[PDB]
Amino acid sequence: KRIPRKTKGKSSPATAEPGTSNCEHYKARPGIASVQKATESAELPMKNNDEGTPDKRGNTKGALDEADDATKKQAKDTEKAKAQVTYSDTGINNANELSRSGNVDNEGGSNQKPMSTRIAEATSAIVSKHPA
Amino acid sequence: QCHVCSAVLFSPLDLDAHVASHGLHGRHITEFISSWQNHPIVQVSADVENRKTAQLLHADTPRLVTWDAGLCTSFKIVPIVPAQVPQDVLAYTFFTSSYAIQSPFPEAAVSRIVVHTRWASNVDFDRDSSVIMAPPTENNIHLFKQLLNTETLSVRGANPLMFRANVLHMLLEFVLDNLYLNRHTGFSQDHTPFTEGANLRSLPGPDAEKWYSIMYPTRMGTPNVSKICNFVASCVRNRVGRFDRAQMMNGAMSEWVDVFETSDALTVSIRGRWMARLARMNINPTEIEWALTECAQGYVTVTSPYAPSVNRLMPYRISNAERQISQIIRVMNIGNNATVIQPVLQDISVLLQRISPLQIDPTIISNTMSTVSESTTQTLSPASSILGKLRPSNSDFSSFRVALAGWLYNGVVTTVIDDSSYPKDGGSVTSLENLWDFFILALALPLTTDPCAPVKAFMTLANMMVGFETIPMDNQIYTQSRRASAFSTPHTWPRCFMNIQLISPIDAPILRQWAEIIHRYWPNPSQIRYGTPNVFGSANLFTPPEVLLLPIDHQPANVTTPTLDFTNELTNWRARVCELMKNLVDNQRYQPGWTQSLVSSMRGTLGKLKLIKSMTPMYLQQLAPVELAVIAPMLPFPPFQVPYVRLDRDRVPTMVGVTRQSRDTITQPALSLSTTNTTVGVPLALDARAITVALLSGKYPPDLVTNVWYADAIYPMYADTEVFSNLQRDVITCEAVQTLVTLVAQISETQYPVDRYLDWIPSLRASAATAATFAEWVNTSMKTAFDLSDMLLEPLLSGDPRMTQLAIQYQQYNGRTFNVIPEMPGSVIADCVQLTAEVFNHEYNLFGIARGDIIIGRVQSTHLWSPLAPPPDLVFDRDTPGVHIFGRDCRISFGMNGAAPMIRDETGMMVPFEGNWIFPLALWQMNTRYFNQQFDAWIKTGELRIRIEMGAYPYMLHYYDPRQYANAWNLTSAWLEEITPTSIPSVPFMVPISSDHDISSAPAVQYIISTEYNDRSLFCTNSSSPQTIAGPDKHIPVERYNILTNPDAPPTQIQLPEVVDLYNVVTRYAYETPPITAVVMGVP
Amino acid sequence: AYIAVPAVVDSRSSEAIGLLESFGVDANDVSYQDHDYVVDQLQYMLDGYEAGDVIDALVYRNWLHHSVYCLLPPKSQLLEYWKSNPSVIPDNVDRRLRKRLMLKKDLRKDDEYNQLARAFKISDVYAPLISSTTSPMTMIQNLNQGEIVYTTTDRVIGARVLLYAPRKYYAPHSRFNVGTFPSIA
Ligand SMILES: [Zn+2]
Predict the structure, then answer these.
(1) Three-class SS of residue A9?
(2) Which biological processes are named by the entry's GO terms (chain B) (predicted)?
């Protein structure tokens, strides 16, 4: 037998005993379906944070705000447009806080020009040619 | 019905499939069945085609067990330059029948070994990270340029500066595509005259005679006289086929067997290591039962019957270091992102909402305040403001349960009371609205996990009492009228709040009373036991691995407790707050302008709020810790906690950081992202009004039974667990971390102690970007191999990936830092890669790499020596007399008026274009098209001979007829033309063809020869004739077929590092992996 | 990202013209804001305030945080609308006032109703209230704090203008967003 692959890679006499009976005489008090949906929602894996990381070609794959988006997502999870639990505009001043941005590379420089382009220009700076 | 788990199924013909889950002989993740109702729950894989009343498993569980039914070999033999010769004996004759002669080795003029993993392998869920090597007559450079040649100037060339990284990644991939478990399969008793009585293993498929011939070299007799026949005759016939079987038999098929079949040593060793790791990882259902029962906190008892079996396999037992490392990785994954942590708290809150029996209803407040009304003449009214400010018509109480959920996650997130819930502007005690804002805020603060909550509570009343009461100040720069929202850091706690005596009761009586009340009656932290430490690991740290720290204290749970039990901390807090407020209101010394005497109404409503039927304090005291402990070990993100302190600003945490460097290094300080926070973690605002109303109005159902309720609530939750998949993910993550640190330390200059097998391959000291991209490639290779879509090792990619060890530490206020360094045990992929590199440095020719360096110079000869193995007089070393070394500062000057041009020697002398030179490859890579322009003309006819020293290089072979004129110049110049500064093409060698009959002697022009012996892949030459006369001589390698030829050699004797051996002793298994089952019984 | 250019950037007409080819920039990816309304609001407020103050407040305003204004009717009218359609009355208001609004036979003769009427001021019922006297800075700050800002006067600078009650009583974040007003926030 075989198992399908999820993520692509390298692409190129006998009688019924008296005990048995189907009755469903009991109704769950907490609610099987309710707690079951709740645990299905809760068991979701944590969302991947991929910004600021390099890729196959070495370019930083992050995007060149998060608190406001989280507040909007919380307000959408709730039914009210206003949010009762927010991550933005809170009293604590945390200006110093930094995030994993795509503007910087692993060397500390700016990704104003991608690493691949920078290496290409550096290596094409001095290349020989055939004599005239 | 089934008499093992009481599973009632209506099909009495496939009960065998169900009893096979228990382990009885007559895909599917878990089978949970209750004891008080007929509603079984089934967990099914996430990516199945259809769901038929079955629940998904939202977790990328690694595929650890993968089987293999083919051959456990990765070195195949390919024929090149085929030839056919007459044979004396044509076929085997038995009565009126004939059988063709099948040689186990290819019959050709030249046969050489090449590595090609899983070439004969019938598996399910292929790891797919295969390594493909073409025969050397083709071009094999397409895998030495895989990693860091995205910006190479020329295609079909590879970077000598990145050869080492490419080779390391290739070795890693070779190791990765071998993590398989050998599969036992049926035999077939042979009766051939040469292999009588032996048991030969038959691969599944259409036919197996060809596979028999390939696997068993000794089956072929000695019909003719030849090299293969001589090797077979030298080989012994006693050791072939099955060696011995096991003793446990499930029917007639043996349990495990080991057979004598063709297989290399490296792959069988790797699979043995993998099997040993899994065997030490396995687990049995009785301690699973114990772990579940212990996690259920005694409200639910679990059982799991099973038949006595030995092959049962279910690897989940892991240590605590792996859990701690995975916890560190998950914490680092956040990086001050408010989007990655919001859903976890958001849905844990709703899970607690569905779990908890406490239902919140402000109609209690409405009914208590309905009887309170005020006259038709007076304007201002307490009760109307009370109702309008508590808002008993709003049914959004998510904040209370969000705070309860965030009790578990201090150090990554901190919950604080949101701004604008404080009194407007500075506030004043002369205003009823400001007073009741103070009431709500003070009643709401203790639940929040903010260390500065007592200071905020005191400073709120201080600000409101500005102008009536005075307290001393120290620096004369922070006035008493300083907003309490700013007090969010331990360094701002005033000495007045530190020492109560500094507040004079003759001047600040109410403030003195409030300070004393805060000091005395603030809730005390405690701890509770959760989970099962022994069977499942504990991913918590900075705390002992079996306690859960709670800001509130806990007591044993019984429902028959008085509502106004003032021994309860929260009820005492509410009563004392109300008492102090009414003491404030009595004298009216603080409320001028109130023409009407509001003291009576104020005291009445304060009493009606002090005493009220609210079961929320009792719930938080008794039942909430039990629910939190029940749900803690089952979460995808295990709780991460930091010690709780109250009124002690010496142990208050301030920062949490992650370090990627060892202790015995002084490196450049790179603080993690999580340390850039004013608080200990990400701030999280909370509305105080919802918390206050939830704490003030909560009631139980009028027929609650705790045992029944929790037995009914735990079962559906425990039927949806993913803890085992999380454990497998965690061990995979730790394996990946160890492999990453080893691989990065191999190529980058670090102080990690590793044994460096391969350093002769030229490379460069990788920078941060190069290390990051190499780490990205190894990460994606591991993810592809283990089929994981979610994150793995990505947080380590950010910053400098040249890491040594993972650790996390947190700093308290006074400066004592607590550092936790989880020791990491020996992994499997890391030492398997080290072993395969140790084998590589002795056998580099098989992978297609030639150690040493080449010599460029015309050799007009009629001899038949192989260029890969030249004779001594055609090579010159560094110590050969009369040679000129060359450094970077080599400068060529022309010769005026008919003089020989001269080049600058590294010693400073000038030498003409003639002689024997020693010349590093870097020089030619730098000055091609100039060194080309001159030396190309000079070498072709003159006496100039150049030795290019390069360590290692890929080579492609060219076979020419030794009896015809041949010239290698058109290939040597072709190689020397496109040696661009960024890459070089494979070095072309021109080797002759071994012959049997006498052949004519024709001249040949050779330019490139290797310095040392670089031809070990040559399996055999002319393996059809009795002997070879003209050409390179080579017989079948006896050294590799040890156990057959060596008489005094035990079956388990292998030369692991020096020479890889074929036809080894591979052990095959047959294991069952039953789904996890449990019968969820109840507790009276 | 936010970019400010010296022009009048709308949604449709500015998208059609582009104005990046017009300024020389070779430009989906860019999203265009609208600011004709805020230019008109600047012209309208420039009467009762000072240009420097308005410019400072508006440059302290940021444009990536969507918000909106909402004009409440004057007091007599607000009470009237609430009385006529009383489902709308907010919970925040006091029980006596809301209960007496949910009644018939209301008129000027009522004593305690009038007591509550001129004892009532809009401080509690609508919390962030831009009154007539509010400085330009506070109004802008509020827009940044919350999604909705309540105001009493038409003369406002910000996102939009909506009417809380019927008329008779009154008497897209892409990668790069362009605009025509710089923000230092
Ligand atoms: Zn069963």
Answers:
(1) coil
(2) 7-methylguanosine mRNA capping
Q: Which of B193, B259, B254 is nearest to B220 (CA)?
A: B193
Q: Which helix (H) or strand (E) holds B966?
A: strand B966-967
What is the rounded distance in angstroms from the CA atom of residue B30 to the CA atom of residue B721?
9
Place of tokens 């012994």: B236
**Alpha helix (H) residue ranges in A46-132:** 66-77, 115-124
What Å resolution does this PDB entry report?
Answer: 3.4
Distance from CA of residue B656 to its chain's centroid? 23
- Residue B157 region, left (φ>0) first, then alpha (ψ -120 to 50), else beta? beta
Is the torsion defined by CA of B622, B623, B625, B629 positive or negative? positive
Q: Do C147 and A81 touch (CB under 8 A)?
A: yes
Q: Tell me the nearest-neighbour CA distance from A112 into chain B, angstroms.
A: 15
CA distance B392 to chain C (A): 9
Token output for B383: 């009760």
Those residues whose C-beta lies under 8 Å from the C-beta of residue B615, and which sit 6 or more positions away, are B358, B563, B698, B699, B700
Q: Spell out which residues have Cβ within 5 A of ligand 1, the ion.
A: B 2, 4-5, 7, 18
Distances, alpha carbon B659 to alpha carbons B665, B671, B752, B802, in Å: 12, 7, 15, 12
Among B377, B383, B393, beta carbon nearest to C91: B393
A79 touches B659 (CB < 8 A): no
- Measured in whole angstroms, the distance separating CA C128 from the mean position of its chain's CA atoms is 11
* H runs (alpha helix) in B177-264: 209-215, 227-234
In 3D space, the residue among B784, B786, B745, B783 whose CA is nearest the CA of residue B766 turns out to be: B745
Helix (H) or strand (E) holding B856: strand B854-861
Q: What are the Cα distances from residue B1071, in Å, to B27, B199, B977?
A: 16, 22, 58
Cβ neighbours around B594 below 10 Å, total: 13
Sort A120 into a burial class: Cβ within 10 Å, 0-12 / 13-18 / 19+. Answer: middle
Q: Per this entry, what is the length of chain A? A: 132
CA distance B596 to chain C (A): 15
Residues of chain A contacting residue B36, judged by C-beta atoms under 8 Å apart: 26
CA atoms within 13 A on the CB side of B423: 29
Neighbours of B312 (CB within 10 A): 17
Token code pair at residue B806? 């993972």
d(CA C79, CA C101): 8
What are the residue ranges of helices labelled H in B356-493? 363-370, 382-390, 398-406, 432-444, 453-464
Tell me the CB-side half-sphere exposure of residue C122, using CA atoms within 13 A: 20
